[PDB]
Write a protein that binds this ligand. Structure first.
Ligand SMILES: OC[C@H]1O[C@H](O)[C@H](O)[C@@H]1O
Ligand SMILES: [Mg+2]
Ligand SMILES: [Mg+2]
Lengths: 287, 287
């Protein structure tokens, strides 16, 4: 069973249904508020666990009631929490407002995620380290260095986009694999050994040591495409070969990640849409 | 020592600092996030208490972990809770967003507050009833009727706008004092005996039985306007003459409310920014 370590963010997603966003100086009432655990790090960790990896999540919870819910969510998905921390203050928070014209406005605050401390002995004995950019770069960097020493694959989801160019250079230099959609790729300072670019419905493409190729997605009709990125990243990490690897294994992993990303669109919601490993097999046979 | 009774809402506030207010569709990363007790009802009770009134609050808490923090906040500011209830499910949630120019947007999922029904003891032995519109309008109406029977002042903060029209109409019919910003004054069914239209950092406008006039506010560099209105409202309630009153006593109340409101903008934070009676005095002496 492949061992994955995720060092990344966990957010409480608060989704408000409103008629319109509030104007300056205005108070507006929501029709509903729905609370759902999320954040890139936790989404990816769940995706990886559902896909069949043994996952350890290393992240930071606040001391708010939200933190208890985020813990319950990860534990129920068989994600390990030996190596997380509790820091005073709020958990990472994402506010998602859906209005009457079905536009989504998002507001994210790092909360606890900004206080995350590297745990090098945790990335020891794991095959794949998966990290993203909702935590501070320095922490992702620290974790990436530990994985390098432990001969673990360093896999970075270059997300969110719009990170500052030179702050990312040291991390770019050290990544084996970088996952990114097209927009995100443009903000990544230098190509890794294995650059994997996601293409919404189409699937993904690869450019690196194994050459250059498209990896198509089983075709499906979407219900909700949110959360499909995080599923892709988690299923990639759960499937990428340990070092030194081989093109056929990396390819197998890419196809599996595409299939899963495609399946995640079939379900509504962000944090709960990761398919099980059997569903990924099924979807792959069905082509 | 004036007896003010607030029937209204209590919420946990999530306050985000941004550069610019998110636009429909946008994804914004926030600079900071705080989690503090609030709600128009609560803020107004606290402000009235710090202003020297003897204050009872009547609202609905959820049976959730947030409730204890909210209750504790009111007790720490000397507000009474004997007429409050508990509605199973969540306490209210609010998202406040504050930007560079100290402007703010407020979005509320009222939770328990939307299920506040009329509490029998709610208004006994009070000089002034202060209410607002996050709770059901029917409940604010009931509180108003009971206040008139006991010859208490019916004071309504007509916020948020757009609530149940027929209940609004019945309430507008009997209200003594209505506090509202320009947008909210507009949505209100018919004018009260004393119509107090707030004007942000400029202070307030009066329309009613005392005539028509402006009341300037001390000139200040706003740090954060979130919560300043609730301060105005509570301070008003704490100083409004027992019916019947002199124009001089009403005027003194408006003056103090403007001074207080402007003080409240100097402080970051929503539910904690109300000044003590002595700071209102010190601000008024300095003109
Ligand atoms: O006026 C600001 C208040 O409005 C909402 O009720 C929030 O809870 C916040 O405390
Ligand atoms: Mg989905
Ligand atoms: Mg303030």
């Amino acid at each position: 069973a492949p061992r994955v370590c995720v060092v990344g963010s966990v957010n409480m997603d608060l989704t408000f249904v409103v008629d319109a966003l509030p104007r300056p100086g205005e108070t507006v009432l929501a029709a509903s508020l729905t609370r759902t655990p999320g954040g890139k790090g936790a989404n990816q960790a769940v995706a990886a666990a559902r896909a069949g990896a043994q996952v350890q999540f290393s992240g930071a919870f606040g001391d708010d009631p939200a933190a208890a819910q985020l813990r319950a969510h990860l534990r129920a998905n068989a994600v390990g929490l030996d190596r997380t921390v509790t820091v005073p203050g709020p958990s990472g928070t994402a506010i998602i407002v859906v209005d009457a014209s079905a536009e989504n406005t998002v507001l994210v605050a790092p909360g606890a995620n900004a206080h995350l401390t590297p745990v090098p002995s945790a990335v020891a004995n794991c095959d794949v380290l998966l990290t993203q950019l909702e935590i501070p770069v320095a922490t992702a960097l620290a974790a990436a260095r530990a994985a390098q020493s432990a001969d673990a694959v360093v896999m970075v989801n270059a997300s969110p986009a719009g990170q500052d160019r030179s702050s990312l250079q040291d991390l770019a230099a050290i990544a084996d694999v970088v996952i990114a959609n097209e927009h995100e790729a443009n903000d990544w300072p230098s190509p890794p050994t294995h650059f994997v670019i996601t293409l919404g419905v189409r699937g993904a493409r690869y450019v690196g040591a194994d050459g250059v190729f498209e990896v198509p997605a089983p075709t499906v009709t979407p219900v909700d495409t949110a959360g499909a990125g995080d599923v892709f990243a988690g299923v990639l990490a759960a499937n990428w070969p340990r070092n030194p690897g081989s093109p056929a294994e990396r390819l197998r992993a890419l196809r599996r990640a595409c299939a899963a990303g495609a399946l995640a669109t079939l379900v509504s919601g962000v944090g709960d849409c990761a398919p099980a490993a059997a569903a990924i097999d099924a979807a792959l046979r069905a082509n």
